[PDB]
Amino acid sequence: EFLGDGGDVSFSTRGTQNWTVERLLQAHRQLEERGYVFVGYHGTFLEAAQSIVFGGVRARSQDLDAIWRGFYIAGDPALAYGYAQDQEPDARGRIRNGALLRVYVPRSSLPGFYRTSLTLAAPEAAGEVERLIGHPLPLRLDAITGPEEEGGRLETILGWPLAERTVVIPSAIPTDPRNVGGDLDPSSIPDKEQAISALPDYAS
Ligand SMILES: CN(C)CC(=O)Nc1ccc2[nH]c(=O)c3ccccc3c2c1
């Protein structure tokens, strides 16, 4: 259990229960001590956050193409935040805010991390990434970081094999239940979390 101590952690529209930036700090120190390193944020809906944190990352399907299939994260919490919410409404039109998660990978997995300046959405990106990674997509126990299709923000994709090796914990950066869909309010980012958010150096 890499969640540190305090009470039971629970995701909810009111905010991640029993999660404070201080507990995150304890959790972060424990992970680092165990040889894990932070690689980015992952925004998703509440239940997927719960599953990811306590069950671990688990690929489910889509092999025909989905060439870029994998676990998408981002060094910049603002990019991942856009995804921390339900993808479709319920029968009554409600779209709940989700949660931001912190993704860690064993340091021994770092050799598989690559970065390119080429926008991943570019048509020839696949060919360039395959050259960079040394094999045909999909990504395996490796990852690639590159500019989002449009926006300039760097997105990181973890091959499912790598993703399933991660330890993921809640972020102390909250989503706003009053502003679903809205952009991340940078002032809602705890200084203490920003402090433990440096990324590892990737190969290019
Ligand atoms: C949940 N819907 C957005 C459908 C989907 O297929 N994608 C998905 C679902 C969750 C995602 N979470 C992220 O943190 C993220 C970060 C950088 C780039 C993409 C993502 C991301 C993408």
Swiss-Prot record:
Question: Which segments carry the region annotation III (required for ADP-ribosyl activity)?
Answer: 7-204
Task: Describe what happens upon changing residue 155 to A.
Answer: 666-fold decrease in ADPRT activity, 14-fold reduction in GH activity, 2-fold increase in dissociation constant for NAD(+), loss of toxicity against mouse cells
Protein name in UniProt: Exotoxin A
- Give the organism's phylogenetic lineage: Bacteria, Pseudomonadati, Pseudomonadota, Gammaproteobacteria, Pseudomonadales
> Which residues does NAD(+) bind?
42-44, 51, 56-62, 155
What range of the parent protein does this fragment cover?
424 to 627 of 638
Summary of the function given for this chain in its UniProt record: An NAD-dependent ADP-ribosyltransferase (ADPRT). Catalyzes the transfer of the ADP ribosyl moiety of oxidized NAD (NAD(+)) onto eukaryotic elongation factor 2 (eEF-2) thus arresting protein synthesis. Has an LD(50) of 65 ng/ml against the human lung epithelial cell line C38.
Q: Which residues form the active site?
A: 155
| Domain notes per entry | Domain I (which is divided into 2 non-contiguous regions Ia and Ib) is required for binding to cells, but not for ADPRT activity. A subtilisin-digested fragment starting about residue 417 and extending to the C-terminus has full ADPRT activity.
The organism is Pseudomonas aeruginosa (strain ATCC 15692 / DSM 22644 / CIP 104116 / JCM 14847 / LMG 12228 / 1C / PRS 101 / PAO1)
Per the UniProt entry, the effect of residue 148 to A is: 833-fold decrease in ADPRT activity, 4-fold reduction in GH activity, 2-fold increase in dissociation constant for NAD(+)
- Region feature Disordered, mapped onto this chain: 173-204
Explain the post-translational modification. Answer: The 8 cysteines participate in intrachain disulfide bonds.
